[PDB]
Coordinates of C-alpha atoms in Angstrom, one line a residue:
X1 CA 24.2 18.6 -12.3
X2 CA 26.4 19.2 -15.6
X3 CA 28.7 16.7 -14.6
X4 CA 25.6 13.8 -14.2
X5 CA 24.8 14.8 -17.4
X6 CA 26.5 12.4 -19.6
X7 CA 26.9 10.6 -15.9
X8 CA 23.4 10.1 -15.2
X9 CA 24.1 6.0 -14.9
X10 CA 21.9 4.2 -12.6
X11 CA 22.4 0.6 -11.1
X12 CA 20.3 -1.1 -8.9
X13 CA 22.2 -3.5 -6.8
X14 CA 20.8 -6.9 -4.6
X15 CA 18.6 -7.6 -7.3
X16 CA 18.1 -11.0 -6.3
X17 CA 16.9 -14.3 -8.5
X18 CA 13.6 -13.8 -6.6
X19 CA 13.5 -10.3 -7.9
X20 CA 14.0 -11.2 -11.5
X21 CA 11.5 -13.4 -11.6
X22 CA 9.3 -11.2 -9.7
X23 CA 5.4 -11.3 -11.9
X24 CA 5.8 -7.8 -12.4
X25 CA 8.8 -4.8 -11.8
X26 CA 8.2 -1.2 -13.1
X27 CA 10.7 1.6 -13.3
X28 CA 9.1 4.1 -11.6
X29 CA 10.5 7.7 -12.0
X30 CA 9.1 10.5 -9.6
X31 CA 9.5 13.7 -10.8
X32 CA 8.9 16.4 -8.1
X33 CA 9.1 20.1 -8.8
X34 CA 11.3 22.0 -6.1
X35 CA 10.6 26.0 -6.0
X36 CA 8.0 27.4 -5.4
X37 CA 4.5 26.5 -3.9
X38 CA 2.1 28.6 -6.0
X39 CA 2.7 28.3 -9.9
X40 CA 1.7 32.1 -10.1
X41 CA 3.8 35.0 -11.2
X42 CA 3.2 38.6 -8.9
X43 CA 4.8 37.5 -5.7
X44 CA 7.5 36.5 -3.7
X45 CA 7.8 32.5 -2.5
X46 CA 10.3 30.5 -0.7
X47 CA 12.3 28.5 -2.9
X48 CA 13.5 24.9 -2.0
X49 CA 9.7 23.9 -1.4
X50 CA 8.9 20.1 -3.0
X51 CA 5.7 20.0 -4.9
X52 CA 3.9 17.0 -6.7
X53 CA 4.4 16.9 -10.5
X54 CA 4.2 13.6 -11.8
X55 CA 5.7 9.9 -12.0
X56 CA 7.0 8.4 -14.9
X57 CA 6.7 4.5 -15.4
X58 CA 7.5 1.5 -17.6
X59 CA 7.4 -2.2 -17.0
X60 CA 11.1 -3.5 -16.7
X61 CA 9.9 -7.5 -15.7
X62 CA 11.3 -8.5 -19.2
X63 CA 13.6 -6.2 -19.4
X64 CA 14.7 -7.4 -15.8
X65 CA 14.1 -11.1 -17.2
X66 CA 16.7 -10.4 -19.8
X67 CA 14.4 -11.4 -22.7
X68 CA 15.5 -8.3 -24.2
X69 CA 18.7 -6.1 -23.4
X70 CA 20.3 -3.8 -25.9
X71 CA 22.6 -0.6 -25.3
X72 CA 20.6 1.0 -28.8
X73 CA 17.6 0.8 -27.3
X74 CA 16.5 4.1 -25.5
X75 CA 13.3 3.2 -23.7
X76 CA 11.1 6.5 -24.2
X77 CA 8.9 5.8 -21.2
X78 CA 5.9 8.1 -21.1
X79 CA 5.8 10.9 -18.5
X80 CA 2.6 11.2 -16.6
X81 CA 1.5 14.4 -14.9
X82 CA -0.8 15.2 -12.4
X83 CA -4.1 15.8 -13.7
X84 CA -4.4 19.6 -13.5
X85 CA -7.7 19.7 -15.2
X86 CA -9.6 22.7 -14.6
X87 CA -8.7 24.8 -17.4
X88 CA -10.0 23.3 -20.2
X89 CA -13.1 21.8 -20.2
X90 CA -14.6 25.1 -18.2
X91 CA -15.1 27.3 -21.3
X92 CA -18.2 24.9 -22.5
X93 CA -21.1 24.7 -19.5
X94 CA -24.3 26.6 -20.9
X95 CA -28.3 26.4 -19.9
X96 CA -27.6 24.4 -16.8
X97 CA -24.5 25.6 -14.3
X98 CA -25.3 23.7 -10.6
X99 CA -22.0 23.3 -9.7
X100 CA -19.9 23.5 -6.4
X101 CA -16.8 22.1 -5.6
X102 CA -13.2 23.0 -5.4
X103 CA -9.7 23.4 -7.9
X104 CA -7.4 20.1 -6.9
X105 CA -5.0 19.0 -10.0
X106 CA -1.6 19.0 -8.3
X107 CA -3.1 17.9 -4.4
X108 CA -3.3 14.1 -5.3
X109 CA -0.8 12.4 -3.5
X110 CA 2.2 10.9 -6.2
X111 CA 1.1 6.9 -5.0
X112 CA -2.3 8.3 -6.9
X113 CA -0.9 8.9 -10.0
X114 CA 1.6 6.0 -9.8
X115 CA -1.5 4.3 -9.4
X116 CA -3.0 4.8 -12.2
X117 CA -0.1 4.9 -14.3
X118 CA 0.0 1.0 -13.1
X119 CA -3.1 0.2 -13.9
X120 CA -3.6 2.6 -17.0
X121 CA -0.7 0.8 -19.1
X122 CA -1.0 3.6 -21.6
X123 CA 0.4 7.1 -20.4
X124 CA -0.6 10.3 -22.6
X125 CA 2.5 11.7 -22.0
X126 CA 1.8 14.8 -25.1
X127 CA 5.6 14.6 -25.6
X128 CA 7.1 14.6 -22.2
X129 CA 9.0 11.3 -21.0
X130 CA 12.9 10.4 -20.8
X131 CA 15.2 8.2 -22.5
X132 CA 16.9 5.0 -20.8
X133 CA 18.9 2.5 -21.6
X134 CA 17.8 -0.4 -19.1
X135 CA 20.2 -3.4 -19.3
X136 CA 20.0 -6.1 -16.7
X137 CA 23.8 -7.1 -15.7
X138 CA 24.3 -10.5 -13.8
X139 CA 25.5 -10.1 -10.4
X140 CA 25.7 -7.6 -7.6
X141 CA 27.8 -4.3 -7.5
X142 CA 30.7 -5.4 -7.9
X143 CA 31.1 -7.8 -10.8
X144 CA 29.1 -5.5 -12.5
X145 CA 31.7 -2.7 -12.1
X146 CA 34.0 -5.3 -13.3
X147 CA 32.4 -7.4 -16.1
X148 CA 30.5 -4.5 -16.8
X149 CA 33.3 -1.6 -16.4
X150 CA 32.9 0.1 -19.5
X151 CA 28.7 0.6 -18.3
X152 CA 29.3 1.2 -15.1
X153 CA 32.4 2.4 -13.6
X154 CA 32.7 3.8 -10.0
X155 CA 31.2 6.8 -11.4
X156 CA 28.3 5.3 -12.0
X157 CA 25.2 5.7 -9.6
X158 CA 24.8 3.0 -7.2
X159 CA 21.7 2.4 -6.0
X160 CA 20.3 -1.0 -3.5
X161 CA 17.6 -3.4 -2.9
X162 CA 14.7 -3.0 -0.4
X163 CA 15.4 -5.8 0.7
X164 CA 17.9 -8.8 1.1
X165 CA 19.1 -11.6 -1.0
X166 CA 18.7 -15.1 -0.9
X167 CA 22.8 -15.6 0.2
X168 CA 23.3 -13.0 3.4
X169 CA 26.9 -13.2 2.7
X170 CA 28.6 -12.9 6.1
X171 CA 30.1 -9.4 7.0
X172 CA 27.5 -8.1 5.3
X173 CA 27.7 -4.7 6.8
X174 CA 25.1 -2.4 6.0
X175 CA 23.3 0.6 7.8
X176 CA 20.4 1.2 4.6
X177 CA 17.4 2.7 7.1
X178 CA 14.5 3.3 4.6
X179 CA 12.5 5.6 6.2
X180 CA 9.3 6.0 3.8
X181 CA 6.7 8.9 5.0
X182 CA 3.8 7.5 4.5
X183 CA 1.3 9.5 5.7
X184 CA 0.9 12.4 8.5
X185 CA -2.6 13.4 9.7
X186 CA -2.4 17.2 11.1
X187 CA -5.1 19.4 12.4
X188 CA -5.4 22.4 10.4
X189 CA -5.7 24.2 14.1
X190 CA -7.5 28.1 13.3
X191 CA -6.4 28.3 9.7
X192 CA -9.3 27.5 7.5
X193 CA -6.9 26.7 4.8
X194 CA -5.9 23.1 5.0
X195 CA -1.6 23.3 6.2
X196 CA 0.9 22.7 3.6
X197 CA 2.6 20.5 6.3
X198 CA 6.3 19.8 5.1
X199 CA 8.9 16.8 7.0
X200 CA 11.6 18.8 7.5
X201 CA 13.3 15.2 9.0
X202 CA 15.6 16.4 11.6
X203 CA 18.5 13.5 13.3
X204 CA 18.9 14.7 16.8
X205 CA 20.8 12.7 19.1
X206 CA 19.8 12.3 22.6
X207 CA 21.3 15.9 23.1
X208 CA 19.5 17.4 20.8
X209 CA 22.4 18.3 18.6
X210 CA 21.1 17.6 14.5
X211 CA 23.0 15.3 12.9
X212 CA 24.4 16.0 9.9
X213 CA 24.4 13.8 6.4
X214 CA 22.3 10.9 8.3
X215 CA 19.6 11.5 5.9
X216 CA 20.1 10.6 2.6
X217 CA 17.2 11.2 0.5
X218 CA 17.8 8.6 -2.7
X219 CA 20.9 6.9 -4.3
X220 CA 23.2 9.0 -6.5
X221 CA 22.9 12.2 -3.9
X222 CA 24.6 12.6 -1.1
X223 CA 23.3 12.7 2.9
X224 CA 21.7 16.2 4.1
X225 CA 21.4 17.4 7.4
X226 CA 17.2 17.7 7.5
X227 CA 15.6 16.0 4.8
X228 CA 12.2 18.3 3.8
X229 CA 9.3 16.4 2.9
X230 CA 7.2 17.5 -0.7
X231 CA 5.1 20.6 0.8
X232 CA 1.5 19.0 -0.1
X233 CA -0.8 22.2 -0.7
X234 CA -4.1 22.9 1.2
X235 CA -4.1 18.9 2.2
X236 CA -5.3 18.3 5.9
X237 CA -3.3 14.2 6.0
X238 CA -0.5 14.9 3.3
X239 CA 0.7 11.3 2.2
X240 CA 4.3 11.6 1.1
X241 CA 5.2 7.9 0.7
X242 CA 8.7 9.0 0.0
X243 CA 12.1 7.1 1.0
X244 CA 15.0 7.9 2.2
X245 CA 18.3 6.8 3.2
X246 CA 19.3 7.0 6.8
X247 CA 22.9 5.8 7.4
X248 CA 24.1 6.9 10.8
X249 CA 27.0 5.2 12.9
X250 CA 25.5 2.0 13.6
X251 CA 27.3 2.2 16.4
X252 CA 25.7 5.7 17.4
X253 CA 22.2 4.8 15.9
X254 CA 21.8 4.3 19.7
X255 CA 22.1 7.2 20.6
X256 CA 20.6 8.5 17.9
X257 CA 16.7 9.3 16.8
X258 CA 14.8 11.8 14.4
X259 CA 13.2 14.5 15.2
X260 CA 10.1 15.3 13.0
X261 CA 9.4 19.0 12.4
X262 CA 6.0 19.9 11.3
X263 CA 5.7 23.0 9.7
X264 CA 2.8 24.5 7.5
X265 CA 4.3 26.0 4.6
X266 CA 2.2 28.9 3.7
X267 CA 1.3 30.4 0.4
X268 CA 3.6 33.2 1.2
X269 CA 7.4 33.9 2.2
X270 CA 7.0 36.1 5.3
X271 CA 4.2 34.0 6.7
X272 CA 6.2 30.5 5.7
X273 CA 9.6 31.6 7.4
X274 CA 7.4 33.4 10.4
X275 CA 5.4 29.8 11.3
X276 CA 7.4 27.3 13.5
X277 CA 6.9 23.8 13.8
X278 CA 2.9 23.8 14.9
X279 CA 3.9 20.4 16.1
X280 CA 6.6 17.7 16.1
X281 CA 6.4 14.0 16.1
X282 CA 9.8 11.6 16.3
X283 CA 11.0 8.2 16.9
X284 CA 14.1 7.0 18.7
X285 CA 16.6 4.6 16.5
X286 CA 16.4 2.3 19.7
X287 CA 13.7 0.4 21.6
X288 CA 13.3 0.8 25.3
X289 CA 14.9 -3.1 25.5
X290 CA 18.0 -2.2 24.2
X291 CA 17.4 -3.4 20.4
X292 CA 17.3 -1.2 17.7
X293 CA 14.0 0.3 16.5
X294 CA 12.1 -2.7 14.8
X295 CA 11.8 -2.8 11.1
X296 CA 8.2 -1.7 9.9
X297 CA 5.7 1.0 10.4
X298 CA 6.0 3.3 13.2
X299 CA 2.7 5.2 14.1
X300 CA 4.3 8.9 15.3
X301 CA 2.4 11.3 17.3
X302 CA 3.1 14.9 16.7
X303 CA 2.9 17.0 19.9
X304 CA 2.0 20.7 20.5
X305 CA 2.8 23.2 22.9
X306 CA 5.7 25.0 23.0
X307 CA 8.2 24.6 20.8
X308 CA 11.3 24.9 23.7
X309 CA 10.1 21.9 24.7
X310 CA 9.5 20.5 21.0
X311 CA 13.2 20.9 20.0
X312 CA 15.1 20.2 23.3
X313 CA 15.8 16.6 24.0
X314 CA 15.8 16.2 27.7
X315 CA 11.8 16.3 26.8
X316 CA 10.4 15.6 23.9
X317 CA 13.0 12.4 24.0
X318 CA 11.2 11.7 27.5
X319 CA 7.7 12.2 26.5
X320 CA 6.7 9.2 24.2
X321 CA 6.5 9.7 20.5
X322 CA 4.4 7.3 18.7
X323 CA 0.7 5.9 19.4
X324 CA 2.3 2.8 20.7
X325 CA 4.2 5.3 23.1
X326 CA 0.8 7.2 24.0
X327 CA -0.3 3.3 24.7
X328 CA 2.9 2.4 27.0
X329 CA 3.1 5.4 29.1
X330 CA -0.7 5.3 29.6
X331 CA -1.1 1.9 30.5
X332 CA 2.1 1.9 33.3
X333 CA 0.3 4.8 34.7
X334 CA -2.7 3.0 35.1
X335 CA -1.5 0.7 37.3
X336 CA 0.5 3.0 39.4
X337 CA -0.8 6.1 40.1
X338 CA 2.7 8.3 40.6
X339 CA 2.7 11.1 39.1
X340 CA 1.7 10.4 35.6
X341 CA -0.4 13.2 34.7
X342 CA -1.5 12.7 30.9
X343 CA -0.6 16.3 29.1
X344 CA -3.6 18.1 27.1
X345 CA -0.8 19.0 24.3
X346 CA -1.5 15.2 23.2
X347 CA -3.6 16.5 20.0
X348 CA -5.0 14.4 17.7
X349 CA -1.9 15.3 15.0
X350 CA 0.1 12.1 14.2
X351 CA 2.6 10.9 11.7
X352 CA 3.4 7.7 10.6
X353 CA 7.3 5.9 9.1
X354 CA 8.4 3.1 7.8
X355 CA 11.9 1.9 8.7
X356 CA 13.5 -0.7 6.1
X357 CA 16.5 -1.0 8.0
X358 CA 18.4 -3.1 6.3
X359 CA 21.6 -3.4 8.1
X360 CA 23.9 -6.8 9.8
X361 CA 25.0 -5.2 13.4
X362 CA 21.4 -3.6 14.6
X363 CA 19.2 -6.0 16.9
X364 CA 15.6 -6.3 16.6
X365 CA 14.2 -9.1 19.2
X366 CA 13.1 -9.1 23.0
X367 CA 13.7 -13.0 23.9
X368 CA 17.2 -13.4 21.9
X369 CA 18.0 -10.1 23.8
X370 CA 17.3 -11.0 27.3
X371 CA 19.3 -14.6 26.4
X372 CA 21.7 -12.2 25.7
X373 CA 21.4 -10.4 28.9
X374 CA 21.2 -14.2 30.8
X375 CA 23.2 -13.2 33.8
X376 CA 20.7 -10.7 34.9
X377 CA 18.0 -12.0 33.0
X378 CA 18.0 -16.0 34.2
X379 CA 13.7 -15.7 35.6
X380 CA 13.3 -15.2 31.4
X381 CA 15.8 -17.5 30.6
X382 CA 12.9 -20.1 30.6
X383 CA 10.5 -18.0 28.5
X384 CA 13.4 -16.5 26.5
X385 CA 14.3 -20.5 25.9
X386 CA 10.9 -21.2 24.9
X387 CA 10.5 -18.2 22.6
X388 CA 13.9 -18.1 21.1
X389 CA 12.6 -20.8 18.3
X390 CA 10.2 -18.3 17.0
X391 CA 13.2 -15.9 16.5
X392 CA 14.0 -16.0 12.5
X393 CA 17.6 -16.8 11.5
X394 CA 18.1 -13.6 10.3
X395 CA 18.1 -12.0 13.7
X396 CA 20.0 -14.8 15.3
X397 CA 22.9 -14.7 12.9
X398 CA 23.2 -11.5 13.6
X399 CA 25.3 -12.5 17.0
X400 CA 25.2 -16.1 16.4
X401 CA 28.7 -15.8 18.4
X402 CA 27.3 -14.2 21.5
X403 CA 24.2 -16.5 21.4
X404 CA 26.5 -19.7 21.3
X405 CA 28.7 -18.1 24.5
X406 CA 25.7 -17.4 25.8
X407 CA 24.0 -20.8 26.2
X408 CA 27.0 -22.5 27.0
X409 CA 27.4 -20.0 29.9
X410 CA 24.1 -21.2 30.8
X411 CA 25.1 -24.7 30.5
X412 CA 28.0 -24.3 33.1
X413 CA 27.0 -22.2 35.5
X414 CA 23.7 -23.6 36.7
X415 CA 23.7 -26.7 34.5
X416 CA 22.0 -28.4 37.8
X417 CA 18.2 -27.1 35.6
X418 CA 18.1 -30.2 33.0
X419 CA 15.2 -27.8 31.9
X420 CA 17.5 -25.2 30.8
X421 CA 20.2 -28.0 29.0
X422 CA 16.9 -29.0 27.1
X423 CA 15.6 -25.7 25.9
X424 CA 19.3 -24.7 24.8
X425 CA 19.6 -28.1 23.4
X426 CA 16.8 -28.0 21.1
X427 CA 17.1 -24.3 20.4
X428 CA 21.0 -25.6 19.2
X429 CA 19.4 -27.8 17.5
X430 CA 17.4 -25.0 15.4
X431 CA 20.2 -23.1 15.3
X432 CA 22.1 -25.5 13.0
X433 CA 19.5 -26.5 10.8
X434 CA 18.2 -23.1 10.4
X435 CA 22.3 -22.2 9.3
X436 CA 22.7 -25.6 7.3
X437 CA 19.5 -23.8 5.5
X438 CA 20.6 -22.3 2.3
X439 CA 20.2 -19.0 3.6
X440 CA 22.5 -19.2 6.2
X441 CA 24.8 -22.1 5.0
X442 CA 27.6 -19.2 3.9
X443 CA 27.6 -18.3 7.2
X444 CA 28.6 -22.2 8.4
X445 CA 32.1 -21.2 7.7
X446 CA 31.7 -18.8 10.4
X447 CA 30.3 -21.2 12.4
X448 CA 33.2 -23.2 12.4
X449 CA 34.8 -20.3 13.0
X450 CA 33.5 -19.5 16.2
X451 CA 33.7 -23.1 16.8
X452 CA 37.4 -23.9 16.4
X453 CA 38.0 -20.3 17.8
X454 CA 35.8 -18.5 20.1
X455 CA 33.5 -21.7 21.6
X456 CA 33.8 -21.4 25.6
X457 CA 32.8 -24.1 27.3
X458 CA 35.1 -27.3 28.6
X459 CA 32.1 -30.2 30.2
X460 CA 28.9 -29.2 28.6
X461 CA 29.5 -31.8 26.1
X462 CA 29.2 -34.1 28.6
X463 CA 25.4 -33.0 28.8
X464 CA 24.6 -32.8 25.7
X465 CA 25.5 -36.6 25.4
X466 CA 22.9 -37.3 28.2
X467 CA 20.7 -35.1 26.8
X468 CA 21.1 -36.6 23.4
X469 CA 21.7 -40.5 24.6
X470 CA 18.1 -39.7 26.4
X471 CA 16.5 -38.2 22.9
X472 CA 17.5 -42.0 21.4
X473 CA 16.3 -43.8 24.8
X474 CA 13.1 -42.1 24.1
X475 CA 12.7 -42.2 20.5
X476 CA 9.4 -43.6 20.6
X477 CA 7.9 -40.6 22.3
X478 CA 5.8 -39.6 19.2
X479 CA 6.9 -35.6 21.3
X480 CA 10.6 -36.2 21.1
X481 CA 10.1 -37.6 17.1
X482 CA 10.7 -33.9 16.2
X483 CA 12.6 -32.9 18.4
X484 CA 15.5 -35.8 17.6
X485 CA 15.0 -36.0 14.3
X486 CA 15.7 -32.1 14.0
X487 CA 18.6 -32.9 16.0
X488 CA 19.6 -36.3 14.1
X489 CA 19.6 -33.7 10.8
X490 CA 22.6 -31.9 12.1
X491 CA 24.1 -34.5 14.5
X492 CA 27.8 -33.9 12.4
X493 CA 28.0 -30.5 13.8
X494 CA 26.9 -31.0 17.2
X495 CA 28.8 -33.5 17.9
X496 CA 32.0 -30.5 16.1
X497 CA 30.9 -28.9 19.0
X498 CA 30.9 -31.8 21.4
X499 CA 33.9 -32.3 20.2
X500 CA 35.3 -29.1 20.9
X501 CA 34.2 -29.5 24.5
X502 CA 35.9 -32.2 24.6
X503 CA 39.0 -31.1 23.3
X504 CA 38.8 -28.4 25.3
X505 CA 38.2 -30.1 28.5
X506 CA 41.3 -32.0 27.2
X507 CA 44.0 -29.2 26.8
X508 CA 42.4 -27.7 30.0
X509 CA 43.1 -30.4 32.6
X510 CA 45.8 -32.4 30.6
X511 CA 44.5 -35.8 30.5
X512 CA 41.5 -37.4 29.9
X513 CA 40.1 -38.6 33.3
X514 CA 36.6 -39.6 31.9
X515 CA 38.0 -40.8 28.9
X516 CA 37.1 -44.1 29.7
X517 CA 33.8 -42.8 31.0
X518 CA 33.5 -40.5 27.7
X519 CA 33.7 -43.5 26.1
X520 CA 31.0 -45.5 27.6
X521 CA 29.0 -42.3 27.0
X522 CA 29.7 -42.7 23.2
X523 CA 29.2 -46.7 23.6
X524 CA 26.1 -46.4 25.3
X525 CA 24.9 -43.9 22.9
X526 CA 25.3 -46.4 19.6
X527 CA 23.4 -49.2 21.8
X528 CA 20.6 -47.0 22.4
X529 CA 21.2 -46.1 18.4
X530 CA 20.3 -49.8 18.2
X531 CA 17.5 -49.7 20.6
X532 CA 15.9 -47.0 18.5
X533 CA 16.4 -49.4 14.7
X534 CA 15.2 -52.6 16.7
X535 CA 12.5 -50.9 17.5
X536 CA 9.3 -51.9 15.0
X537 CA 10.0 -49.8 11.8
X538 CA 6.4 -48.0 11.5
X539 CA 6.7 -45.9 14.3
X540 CA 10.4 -44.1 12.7
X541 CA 10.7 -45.4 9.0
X542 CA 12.1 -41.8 8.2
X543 CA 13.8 -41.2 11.1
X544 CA 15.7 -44.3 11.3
X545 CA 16.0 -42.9 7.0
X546 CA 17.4 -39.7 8.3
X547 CA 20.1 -41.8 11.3
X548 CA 21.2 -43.7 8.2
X549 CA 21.6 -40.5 6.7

């Protein structure tokens, strides 16, 4: 790219306070050699093959700690190749050759070298690196490209964190799916010669139609409609351990999966472009519960059999894809034996993802889900309660809106299960204290929001003062201490939502009927205040700290 030439500016964004003071940052650059697979001149190869060449690295933790930043300074960091050593040292072996074994300098994995280029912290590079200006610039994208303009305008590269910062701003709206290729284990079938298996990464949807630009294989270059794994030579479990970008609708993600093309890549042309996909593994975007596909490692299993049936949706979609699939449909065919007849295509090929999806909108829980889906689901609604706790912020904030409606439907419309106003009491009572957290107390704003804009309910306040006025009545249960002192460390905001019952219940039915009975509610609620303080001080010294508080 001419035009990167003297454009060639990179910026990592997110970089959290975390991440600068991280014990240890490198900037690793992976140089991979696209062409072709045998470095041979006499025949024909395919071009656009990836092959392993070498990873350069340098420690940037200072540099990142800002002890020293300087435009001047072009870091020379050593290149480090793959150690193709076989064609030196064989000139001297006299009196004594007992030797058997095989030529592998380029069929290490790249994690190997980086590996050793980590823990060797001297790199022979024999005159081959690349110059760099690293800077660290305070703050995220944007008042970078404005404090910083001159370094990095909008031409400049932009490049993101794996990972999220300490202040999820709200509308944070992402779709960053890091899918890493870590490793693929395929049978070498009847070729002696280990396959040069290449992930040609294919987004179908659940037509079978590819999708186009959903893979993006790095910051700085755009999406592609297959992204092709490096084509490992003569290696039986190639491990690629390469990210890319996936950044579909995330709205259509949904709909949405990747399909996972196996194919050896031969020494030659004619035989490369003549093999199909052997087999094909993929994963769909979306769990069978309706949540998007979870964020970790995803064990694939690549099929076999024919390949009509590998690249149309209607049944590779159908038939399970991962080991954890193999597991699922196995074990609901075991109890029910209805036609579930277990295929002998199931080889013993698998591949295995990582999916850092980093993204706002896309849900990744089964509990908060079925809370969600509490009109149908109200048999869970107990065990969804009584798991929803577990559930980290960082899911729940995702529809913190919908989970708010959501229990305060509960509340009204079967309010008569003082079971259920206790689990979504105390699970309220995470809720705020988790959002009060630092983490999530940017998003408090939009708590308010929903509050004085979007809350739904018009007498549940009325139960959460009994439920409440019953925490203080019992404040001597050594169980309850917890659970109302968690809920005395936000009392301001419940009672902005009790409040906002309240009022609603007011501009709903005019007057305030139960005023008077409100009241005595709030009345009866500071006596049993002062039943609580009365009470000997041992037993709640920092809980009657926190009431004061």
């Amino acid at each position: 790219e001419i035009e990167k030439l003297n454009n060639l500016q990179a910026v990592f964004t997110d970089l959290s306070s975390m991440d600068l003071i991280r014990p240890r940052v490198s900037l690793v650059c992976q140089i991979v050699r696209v062409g072709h697979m045998e470095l041979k001149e006499g025949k024909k190869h395919t071009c656009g093959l990836r092959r392993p060449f070498g990873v350069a690295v340098m420690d940037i933790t200072d540099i990142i700690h800002g002890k020293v930043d300087d435009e001047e300074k072009q870091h020379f960091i050593p290149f480090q190749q793959i150690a193709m050593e076989t064609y030196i040292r064989q000139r001297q072996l006299i009196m004594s050759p007992l030797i058997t074994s095989h030529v592998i300098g380029e069929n290490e994995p790249l994690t190997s070298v980086l590996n050793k280029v980590i823990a060797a912290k001297e790199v022979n590079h024999k005159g081959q690196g690349l110059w760099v200006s690293l800077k660290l610039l305070p703050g995220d994208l944007t008042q970078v490209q404005k404090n910083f303009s001159h370094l990095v305008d909008r031409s400049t590269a932009i490049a993101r964190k794996m990972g999220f910062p300490e202040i999820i701003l709200p509308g944070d709206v992402r779709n960053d799916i890091y899918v890493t290729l870590i490793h693929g284990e395929f049978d070498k079938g009847k070729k002696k010669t280990p396959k040069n298996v290449e992930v040609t990464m294919s987004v179908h949807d659940e037509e079978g139609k590819l999708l186009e630009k959903a893979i993006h294989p790095g910051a700085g270059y755009e999406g592609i409609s297959e992204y092709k794994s490096v084509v490992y030579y003569q290696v039986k479990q190639p491990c690629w351990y390469e990210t890319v970008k996936v950044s579909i609708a995330i709205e259509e993600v949904t709909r949405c999966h990747i399909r996972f093309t196996f194919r050896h890549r031969s020494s030659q042309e004619t035989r490369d472009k003549s093999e199909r996909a052997f087999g094909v593994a993929f994963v769909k975007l979306m769990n069978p519960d309706g949540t998007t596909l979870q964020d970790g490692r995803h064990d694939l299993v690549v099929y076999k059999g024919d390949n009509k049936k590998m690249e149309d949706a209607k049944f590779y979609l159908t038939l399970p894809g991962t080991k954890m699939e193999m597991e699922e449909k196995e074990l609901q065919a075991s109890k029910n034996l209805v036609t579930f007849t277990p295929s002998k295509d199931s080889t013993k090929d698998s591949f295995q993802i990582a999916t850092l999806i980093c993204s706002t909108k896309l849900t990744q829980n089964v509990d908060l889900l079925g809370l969600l889906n509490w009109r149908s689901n109200s048999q869970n609604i107990k065990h969804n309660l009584k798991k929803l706790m577990e559930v980290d912020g960082g899911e729940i904030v995702k529809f913190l809106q919908d989970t708010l409606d959501a229990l305060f439907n509960i509340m009204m419309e079967m309010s008569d299960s003082e079971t259920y106003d206790f689990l979504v009491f105390d699970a309220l009572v995470f809720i705020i204290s988790l959002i009060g957290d630092i983490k999530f107390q940017h998003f408090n704003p939009v708590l308010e929001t929903y509050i004085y804009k979007h809350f739904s309910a018009t007498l549940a306040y009325v139960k959460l003062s009994k439920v409440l006025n019953f925490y203080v009545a019992n404040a001597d249960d050594s169980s309850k201490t917890e659970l109302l002192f968690a809920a005395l460390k936000a009392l301001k905001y419940l009672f902005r939502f009790i409040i906002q019952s309240r009022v609603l219940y007011l501009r709903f039915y005019g007057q305030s009927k139960d005023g008077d009975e409100f009241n005595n509610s709030i009345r009866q609620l500071f006596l049993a205040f002062n039943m609580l303080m009365d009470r000997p001080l041992e037993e709640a010294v920092k809980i009657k700290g926190a009431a004061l508080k």
